[PDB]
Write a structure and sequence with these properties.
The PDB classes it as ligase. The chain is of the alpha+beta class. The protein is built from 25 helices and 34 strands. The chain binds ligand OVB, magnesium ion and zinc ion.
Length: about 850
C-alpha cells in the first residue's frame, strides 16, 4: 500500500474493477429485489456544471447504498437533447445542432464516467435520436385520433425582427428580449394535450404520494387549482342593453368560489374581451384604450398575481339576483378571458384583491361575514375578513347566522329555484400547448391534406425523421423553409400534402424517458411489457426543485396516459422524490468604462490569517469582491467541476458536494470546504495505512464481547451506533452531511483508543471495515481501494454493515441496599435509593 493518497492512481483502477464486474449493468432478474433510482437527466449543454455533480452524486449515494443492501439497482443516464441551446449554438458557431449535441454527449459522458457514478450505460438514451422520439410521435398519433391531442387556434407573441415566436417570459414591456421590437399577437393553429380531462386524477392521486415533500404536492394542487363554486347570473339592467346580443343582453354570468358572500357584492368585473366591455367601449375612447392595453399584455403566470390590478367603469349595470342591488360593471385587467365566464363579482370586505381594488377606486365594501366579536374596519384589511371556516353571515337577510357550507347550499337552492345559478366545479389548469416554432425538436407526426384534413402519420411510417443536416440561420423556423422536408404525399389518399413543420415542446421527451430506460432498445413499443412489469415505478427520483410543477405534472400525466393505453400498470411514476437546492458562489468584477461592471470567473481569481482583497491570478492586479448568488453565465461565477476533478480527484468532489449542505439547501462554493474534504480523505487513507503498517489485516471482531475491555466495548458501541446513524441517514433522512460527520466521530474515538492488543486489532479491523463500507456510497474509489487492503472479499458482496445490537447494551448495575444491615458511583446511587463491599452490597450506615 502506497503511503500517500493519490486519487489519479486509484480512481481509474476502481472504475475498471466495477466496469469489469458489470455491477451496474442490470437485467430483469426476478432473483434479486429491484430498486430503480433515477436522477433527472441533463441537457447535453457542453460540459457538466456543479449542479450536475451535486445531483448525480446524491443519486449515486442512494444507488450504491441500495446496491450494498442487496437490491438489483437500476441507475440509468441519458440525454435530454432537443431544445434551444443547440439552435443558439448553431447560429453562433455555424454548426449543426445535431453535431453540436453529439459532441457534447460524448464529452459529458466521459466526465460522468470519471466521477465514478454506478450507471447502467447499456441503458443510455439520447432523446434526439429517431429510435427514441418515434415512440412519442407514436403516442401522439394514438391520442390525436382519440381527441386527447387536438388542434386549435391559439394566440402567440410574434417577434417580427427575429422572425420567431416568444414565450411571455421573453417579452419585456411588449418587446422581444433580444430584438427589442414590439411583439405581435397572432392567432395560429396549434396542438394541445387535453390534460384538463385528467385534472381530477392528477389532483387526487397526489394524496397517494406519502414520500413526496408536502410543498411539491401543495404546488401541484395550486397549479391544478380545482375550486367548488357557484355560477351566478346577474340580469342586465334595462338601461344597459345597448349593443348586446343573445344571453349577453339578458344576463352577466359569473363564477364565484364565495357564494356565501353574494349579499356583499358591490360591483362586477369583466374581461377586456367580454361582450359587455365591447358594447360599453363602443363610444368611450378610454375604454377602447384600456381594452387594447389588456390585450397587448404578456404577463407570465408566475407574475400574474404581482401585476398591478386596474379597471375602468363602463356605465353598465346588472342586478344581484339575491338582494336586488344594481351593481356597476367594471372592465378589469385581472379578469382573464377563457377562465370561467371571463367575468367575476367583487366582495371587497372578504377578498383581499377586491379590498385593494375597491380601496383604490373608493368602491363600496359591505361586510357580510362575522368572526366572533372581532371589529370590522372598512379602511384596513384584516386576515379574518377572508376566513371561511370560522365565519357567520351578517347583513344577509334570511341568510344571517349560517356558516360557510350551509350558506353555500342555501344560496345554491335560492339561485337554482330562480334559474339564476347553480353549483359548478372549475380548474385553473389550462390544456398543454405542445406546438413549438423551432427546428431542433421532435417533428409532429401530422400531414396536412386539402382533401383528408390533418392526418396522423401511420405507425408503419414512424418516425417522421427530423433532418440533422441543418444549420439554423435566425430568419424563421428552418423546417418551414425546407420543401424537401414538408412536401409529401397524403398517407390517406396519396395526394399532394404538406408535413406539419412545428416541433414538440421538449417537455414531452422528459415526460416518459423513465419508462424508456426500462427497455431502451425495444423497437416494438414505448416500453416492453416484460420490463415495465418488472421495474414498475421509479423508487427514488432526484432533481432540482425548479421542476416541481411542470415537468412532474407532465410526467404524472404521461404515466396515466400510458397506463390507459395499456403500456404500464402504475398510476404514478415516482414513489420517493428528493428535491435539491441550487449551487451558489461569490461574484467578482472590475469596474467599467461607463459606470457598469465586467464579471470575472472565481477560478481566475486569487484572494489575499484573515483574507482581505482579491486579485486576478494572471497579473496580480486587484478585483472587486461582490455578492454570492446562484452560479450562472450571467455574473460569470460558475466553478467548472472539471477543474475541481483535475485538482483533487472525483472522490473529493463527491465528498464536498455531500458534506457542504443537505440536498434541499443552497450549497455555497468554498475553497476551504473543498480542501477540508480532501484532507479528510488523506486522513482516512493514513488511518488504514498506519493500521496495516503495524501488523497487517486480522479477522474483524465479531460475536460475544464479554471479556472485551471497557475501552474496546466503548469503541464497538460508537461503531454500531454510527452504522445505525448512517443507515438512518441514507435510508430515511436523506441528509448525508450528518452521515459523514458521524463516521468522522467514529474515527475520532478510534484515534483516542489504544487498539494495539490482539483484541484491539480485531476491533480496529471491525471499525475500519465498517467505516469504508459506510462511506463507499459517497467516496467509492478510495473505499474500494482501502477495503481491498483490509479484506479479500468483494466489498459489494460483503454488503452493508449490520448493527450488532449486543454492542449497544450498557454494562448493567445490580446490588443490594441495606440501612443498618437490613434490606463512588455505587455510593451515589444507593443514596438515591458509608460501607460498600466492591460490586455486591452497599450498607448505608445511619
Ligand atoms: C427531467 C428533465 C426535465 C431535466 C432537464 N433535462 C434539466 O433540468 N436538465 S439540466 O441539465 O439543466 O439539469 C439536470 C439535473 O441536474 C442539475 C439540476 C440543477 C439544480 C439547480 N442548479 C443549477 C446549478 C448550476 C447551473 C449552471 C452552472 O454553471 C454555470 F452556468 F456555468 F455557472 C452551475 C450550477 N446549480 N444548481 C437540475 O434541476 C436537474 O435535476
Ligand atoms: Mg401507499
Ligand atoms: Zn389525403
Amino acid at each position: 500500500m502506497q503511503e500517500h493518497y493519490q486519487p489519479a492512481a486509484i480512481e481509474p483502477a476502481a472504475q475498471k474493477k466495477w466496469d469489469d464486474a458489470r455491477i451496474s449493468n442490470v437485467s430483469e432478474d426476478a432473483s434479486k429485489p429491484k430498486y430503480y433510482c433515477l436522477s433527472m437527466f441533463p441537457y447535453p449543454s457542453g460540459k457538466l456544471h456543479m449542479g450536475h455533480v451535486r445531483n448525480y452524486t446524491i443519486g449515486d449515494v442512494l444507488s450504491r447504498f441500495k446496491l450494498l443492501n442487496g437490491f438489483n439497482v437500476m441507475q440509468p443516464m441519458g440525454w435530454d437533447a432537443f431544445g434551444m441551446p443547440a439552435e443558439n449554438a448553431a447560429m453562433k458557431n455555424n454548426v449543426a445542432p445535431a453535431a453540436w449535441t453529439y459532441d457534447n454527449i460524448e464529452y459529458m459522458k466521459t466526465q460522468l464516467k470519471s466521477l465514478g457514478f454506478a450507471v447502467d450505460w447499456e441503458r443510455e438514451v439520447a432523446t434526439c435520436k429517431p429510435e427514441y422520439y418515434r415512440w412519442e410521435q407514436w403516442l401522439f398519433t394514438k391520442l390525436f385520433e382519440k381527441g386527447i391531442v387536438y388542434r386549435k387556434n391559439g394566440t402567440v407573441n410574434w417577434d417580427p425582427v427575429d422572425q420567431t415566436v416568444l414565450a411571455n417570459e421573453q417579452v419585456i414591456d411588449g418587446r422581444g428580449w433580444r430584438s427589442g421590437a414590439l411583439i405581435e399577437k397572432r392567432e395560429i393553429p396549434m396542438y394541445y394535450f387535453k390534460i384538463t380531462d385528467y385534472a381530477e386524477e392528477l389532483l387526487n392521486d397526489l394524496d397517494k404520494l406519502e414520500h413526496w415533500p408536502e410543498q411539491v404536492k401543495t404546488m401541484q394542487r395550486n397549479w391544478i387549482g380545482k375550486s367548488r363554486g357557484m355560477t351566478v347570473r346577474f340580469a342586465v339592467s334595462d338601461d344597459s342593453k345597448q349593443g348586446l346580443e343573445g344571453d349577453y343582453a339578458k344576463f352577466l354570468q359569473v363564477y364565484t368560489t364565495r357564494p356565501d358572500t353574494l349579499m356583499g357584492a358591490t360591483y362586477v368585473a369583466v374581461a377586456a374581451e367580454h361582450p359587455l366591455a365591447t358594447a360599453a367601449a363602443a363610444d368611450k375612447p378610454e375604454l377602447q384604450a384600456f381594452i387594447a392595453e389588456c390585450k397587448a399584455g404578456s404577463v407570465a403566470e408566475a407574475d400574474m398575481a404581482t401585476m398591478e390590478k386596474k379597471g375602468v367603469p363602463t356605465g353598465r349595470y346588472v342586478v344581484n339576483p339575491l338582494n336586488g342591488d344594481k351593481l356597476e360593471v367594471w372592465i378589469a385587467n385581472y379578469v382573464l378571458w377563457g377562465y370561467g365566464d371571463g367575468a367575476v363579482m367583487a366582495v371587497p370586505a372578504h377578498d383581499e384583491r377586491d379590498f385593494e381594488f375597491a380601496a383604490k377606486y373608493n368602491l363600496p365594501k359591505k361586510q357580510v361575514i362575522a368572526v366572533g366579536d372581532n371589529a370590522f374596519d372598512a379602511n384596513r384589511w384584516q386576515e379574518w375578513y377572508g376566513d371561511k371556516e370560522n365565519g357567520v353571515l351578517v347583513n344577509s337577510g334570511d341568510l344571517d347566522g349560517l356558516d360557510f357550507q350551509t350558506a353555500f347550499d342555501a344560496v345554491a337552492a335560492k339561485l337554482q329555484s330562480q334559474g339564476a345559478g347553480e353549483p359548478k366545479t372549475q380548474y385553473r389548469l389550462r390544456d398543454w400547448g405542445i406546438s413549438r416554432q423551432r427546428y431542433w425538436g421532435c417533428p409532429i407526426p401530422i400531414v396536412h391534406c386539402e382533401k383528408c384534413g390533418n392526418v396522423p402519420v401511420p405507425a408503419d411510417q414512424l418516425p417522421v425523421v427530423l433532418p440533422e443536416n441543418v444549420v439554423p440561420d435566425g430568419m424563421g423556423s428552418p423546417l418551414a423553409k425546407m420543401p424537401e422536408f414538408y412536401e409529401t404525399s397524403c398517407p390517406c389518399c396519396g395526394g399532394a400534402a404538406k408535413r406539419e413543420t412545428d416541433t414538440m415542446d421538449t417537455f414531452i421527451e422528459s415526460s416518459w424517458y423513465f419508462f424508456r430506460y426500462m427497455s431502451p432498445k425495444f423497437s416494438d413499443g414505448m416500453v416492453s411489457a416484460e420490463s415495465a412489469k418488472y421495474w414498475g415505478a421509479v423508487d427514488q427520483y432526484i432533481g432540482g426543485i425548479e421542476h416541481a410543477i411542470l415537468h412532474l405534472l407532465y410526467a404524472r400525466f404521461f404515466t396515466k396516459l400510458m397506463r390507459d393505453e395499456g403500456l404500464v400498470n402504475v398510476d404514478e411514476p415516482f414513489e420517493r422524490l428528493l428535491t435539491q437546492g441550487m449551487v451558489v458562489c461569490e461574484t467578482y468584477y472590475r469596474e467599467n468604462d461607463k459606470g457598469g461592471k465586467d464579471w470575472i470567473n472565481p477560478a481566475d481569481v486569487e484572494l489575499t490569517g484573515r483574507p482581505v482583497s482579491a486579485v486576478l491570478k494572471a497579473d496580480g492586479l486587484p478585483v472587486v469582491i461582490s455578492g454570492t448568488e446562484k452560479m450562472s453565465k450571467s455574473k460569470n461565477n460558475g466553478v467548472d467541476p472539471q477543474e475541481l476533478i483535475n485538482a483533487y480527484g472525483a472522490d473529493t468532489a463527491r465528498l464536498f458536494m455531500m458534506f457542504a449542505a443537505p440536498p434541499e439547501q443552497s450549497l455555497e462554493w468554498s475553497d476551504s470546504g473543498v480542501e477540508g474534504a480532501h484532507r479528510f480523505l488523506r486522513r482516512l487513507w493514513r488511518t488504514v495505512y498506519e493500521y496495516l503498517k503495524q501488523g497487517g489485516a486480522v479477522k474483524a471482531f465479531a460475536g460475544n464481547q464479554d471479556g472485551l475491555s471497557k475501552e474496546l466495548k466503548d469503541l464497538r458501541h460508537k461503531l454500531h451506533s454510527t452504522t445505525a446513524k448512517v443507515s438512518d441517514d441514507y435510508g430515511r433522512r436523506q441528509q448525508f452531511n450528518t452521515a459523514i460527520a458521524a463516521v468522522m466521530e467514529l474515527l475520532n474515538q478510534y484515534d483516542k483508543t489504544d487498539t494495539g492488543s490482539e483484541q484491539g486489532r480485531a476491533v480496529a479491523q471491525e471499525v475500519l471495515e465498517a467505516a469504508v463500507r459506510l462511506l463507499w456510497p459517497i467516496v467509492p474509489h478510495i473505499c474500494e481501494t482501502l477495503w481491498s487492503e483490509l479484506n479479500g472479499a468483494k466489498l459489494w458482496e460483503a454488503g452493508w454493515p449490520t448493527v450488532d445490537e449486543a454492542a449497544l447494551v450498557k454494562s448493567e448495575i445490580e446490588v443490594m441496599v441495606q440501612v443498618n444491615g437490613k434490606l463512588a458511583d455505587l455510593e451515589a446511587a444507593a443514596l438515591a435509593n458509608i460501607i460498600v463491599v466492591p460490586g455486591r452490597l452497599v450498607n448505608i450506615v445511619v
